[PDB]
């Protein structure tokens, strides 16, 4: 935050969604100044509105990344925090088409969008990045084997590029999610040692709370509530 | 008057280090610490730069962890809402020259004291049915060892798995159950360290630097916050991208 | 073995026929002094054209992922033709491999990774998020079909070479100098013959694990 | 076939009176290693030797105590004129009981033997080996528990825990006198009915794991097939807590 220019701000991909809404409500209640960003310029919009900025993007593509980089940049300034909330989520059923999809939006969308990040934060010597994962792509799970290797891939980037950027001042975290409500049950619940699943805004703290400690790149900060412990 | 405002914190081994560090950090968050500590001449000392109070006792005895929890819960009217233990102790040697006196020393107070502060932490919130956040320091060290604490990595080692048992027999009663694992961080214990040996593992460091224990202590001051409500049996690392 | 001719794929066959070399150029001098093909990882169409060899010929009870590229370079340099080259192969070039093995089997996968998929390392940003994830993708896998008498896991080697320094990164690793690739070779053969053991990593590590 | 890849080995397995550690003593001696038995029980170890050539015997001495510790690796070196080049600590005992209620007993007991003890044993070994100029390789079991934690288990995971710190730790500076130190993590073996069958529904495999493949592994880490592989966990769970 600040007193007067707000030299603290943040880009949030797929901050129209779950996770991305309660990082970005979050972060404009402490000084943060946002800018909501996803696929739909419309749901970027209105969260903005609901000052702050919107605009419109596709992390797969990589010259929309690069585009979409240097129009946040010229309507806010240089981005020193980078939260990376846009992703999505059987064997022999699986087509190619879906794999290589989810994997350049999930993986591929965040390390391009980490790429156009360090062209402005190297320079500077300055910022932090979250990127989204899961324990899923750590501890894996039933059911979601190509969003497993995603979110997997993800925390070997974030760790790989946080030793490389880390004597420029810059850190790179992950953080691991279990079961949230966003856009069977009872049985698996019961397992969990808090005995429900975890809230939106939850997850937005510890994203929060990775941005503001100056001493912690490269670690996987997993909220799950003791999920990790029983699957 | 902040973001815990109405909890009570209760740190072992606040009088000195992270511990101190812990103290002013809850304290600047609204909270009343209660500070406890092997000497009570450095627990006094915290308690003067932040009603709070301070507490005499050994971790490693069982006496000692008993009283602590009825001399806190019967002195403030209630049972600490944050548990932090901190209390830690280095006898360094290699395996070929490390003395049984070296093993149960660090083993007693780091990894059996901990267990004794978060058994009776836990026996004190669930007898008045209070909920609460329990916070155990271990270290990066207990996670990839370190040459010549082949006892502390073993203590702190024991503290992660230690800590993750506790969470999935407290998380029904409401009670969170945490791990921190710092790096090398600019404290008295530290200060044991040689210079020239400093300087190379701040070269080891990624952001090449030693972490300072208010860093620490602004971990340990979100696990213990609501903001961590769904946060329990993890540990989180403040190395500065060390053994990561 | 997928890429069985250069690197550890070789070690894995040459130490499996002591006891159907799969490789993107022909591949067959590997086959000339080895019991028991081309293929690229990138496509699944050329994928399938060798797991439909595999009936004829023999008819896949073991199957081994050592194909991989590496080419180190910092992010801003990287370019996106190398990003996607990469992750196509050492990634989703595993996917379609087990996606067409799991046809059969109804069996034992080991996916040859790294110990820099799951601890990073510099100047291989890109690297590092390809063999760190088939971790999680084997970890997925393994729960799906553990009931089905079939187990993958994953080998994580650290620094694997002809003892070859850097420079000098030899004094840092507790374990002499850098590992060859028969003894992470031994490593392949122990997870596959090795009943009770699914969706665990195993890294030929050397004391490098401790350290970055 | 294709076995006795430990001709000329000197085996020390703690605990082998019964469960996994007489499991292990059947599989290193099978492949031609000199097993040296130790157990609490010198009725049990010497057993386990009746069950295996290389002129083996049994030792009785308490993990848990230095002395006798100290004095187990002495009478291994008199009667065999060489310290043992394999070492491998199974002797450990679980006593389950609420973080609430568990008493001070529950907790030393545990500590004593499964984390202690092997200290005192993993220590003993590497000055014998290392005073004698020989290369070695030192294996300690450490359950799935003392990863991930178990309820009713607190004394047990951090005991468990801890070993695997411990060996890490030894890995490290017994790396440059070449003795590897390795640590395995065996998930639910039926060793000496209700809460079982709820266990193997958990497990992917779906079954409970036997003591003979727990020292299938111990077989691998401490021939030279595994000669690169130091300060590394091995996972013999059937996929359970993955
Ligand atoms: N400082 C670091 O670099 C570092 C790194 C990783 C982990 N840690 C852990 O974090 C914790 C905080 O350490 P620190 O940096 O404050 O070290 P420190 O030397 O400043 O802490 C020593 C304090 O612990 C207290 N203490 C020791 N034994 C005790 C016992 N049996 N009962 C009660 N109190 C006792 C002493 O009174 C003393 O005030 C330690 O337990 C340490 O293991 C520290
Ligand atoms: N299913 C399991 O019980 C299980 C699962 C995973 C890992 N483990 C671990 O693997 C190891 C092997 O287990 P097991 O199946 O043989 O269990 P077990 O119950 O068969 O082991 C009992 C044996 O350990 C010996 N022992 C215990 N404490 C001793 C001491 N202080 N000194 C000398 N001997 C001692 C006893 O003589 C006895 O023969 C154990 O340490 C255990 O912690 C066990």
């Known amino acids: ?231 | 008057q902040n973001r815990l405002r109405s909890a009570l914190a209760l740190v072992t081994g606040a009088g000195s280090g992270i511990g101190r560090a812990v103290s002013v950090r809850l304290a600047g968050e609204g909270a009343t610490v209660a500070a406890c500590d092997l000497d009570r001449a450095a627990a006094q000392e915290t308690v003067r730069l932040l009603n709070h109070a301070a507490f005499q006792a050994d971790v490693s005895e069982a006496r000692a962890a008993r009283c602590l929890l009825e001399q806190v819960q019967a002195c403030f009217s209630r049972p600490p809402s944050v548990v932090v233990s901190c209390a830690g102790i280095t006898q360094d040697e290699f395996l070929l020259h490390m003395s049984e006196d070296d093993w149960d020393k660090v083993i007693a107070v780091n990894l059996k004291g901990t267990f004794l502060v978060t058994q009776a932490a836990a026996q004190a919130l669930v007898s008045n049915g209070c909920r609460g956040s329990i916070i155990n320091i271990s270290s990066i060290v207990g996670k990839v060892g370190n040459v010549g604490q082949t006892n502390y990595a073993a203590s702190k080692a024991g503290v992660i798995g230690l800590t993750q048992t506790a969470a999935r027999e407290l998380g029904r009663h409401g009670i969170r159950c945490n791990s921190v694992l710092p790096g090398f961080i600019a404290t008295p214990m530290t200060q044991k360290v040689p210079q020239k040996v400093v300087d190379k593992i701040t070269e080891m460091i990624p952001m090449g630097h030693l972490g300072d224990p208010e860093d620490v202590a602004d971990v340990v001051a979100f696990l213990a916050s609501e903001d961590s409500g769904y946060i329990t049996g993890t540990s989180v690392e403040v190395t500065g991208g060390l053994f990561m």
């Open chain 1, 1 to 231: 935050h600040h007193h007067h220019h707000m030299d603290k701000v943040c880009a949030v991909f797929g901050g129209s969604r779950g996770i991305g809404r309660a990082v970005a409500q979050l972060m404009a209640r402490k000084g943060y100044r946002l800018a909501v960003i996803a696929r739909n310029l419309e749901g970027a919009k209105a969260a903005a509105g609901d000052d702050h900025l919107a605009f419109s993007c596709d992390v797969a593509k990589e010259h929309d990344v690069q585009n979409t980089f240097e129009e946040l940049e010229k309507h806010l300034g240089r981005v020193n925090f980078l939260v990376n909330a846009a992703g999505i989520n059987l064997l022999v059923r699986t087509k190619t088409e879906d794999m290589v999809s989810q994997l350049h939006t999930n993986l591929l969308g965040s390390m391009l969008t980490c790429k156009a990040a360090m062209r402005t934060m190297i320079q500077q010597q300055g910022g932090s990045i979250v990127n989204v994962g899961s324990i899923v792509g750590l501890k894996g799970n039933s059911g979601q084997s190509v969003y497993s290797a995603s979110k997997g891939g993800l925390v070997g980037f974030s760790r790989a590029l946080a030793k490389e950027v880390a004597r420029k001042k810059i850190r790179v975290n992950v953080v691991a999610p279990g079961f949230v409500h966003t856009d069977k049950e009872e049985h698996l619940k019961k397992n969990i040692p808090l005995g429900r699943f975890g809230e939106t805004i939850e997850v937005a703290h510890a994203v929060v709370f990775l941005l503001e400690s100056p001493y912690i790149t490269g670690h996987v900060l997993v909220v799950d509530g003791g999920l990790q412990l029983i699957l």
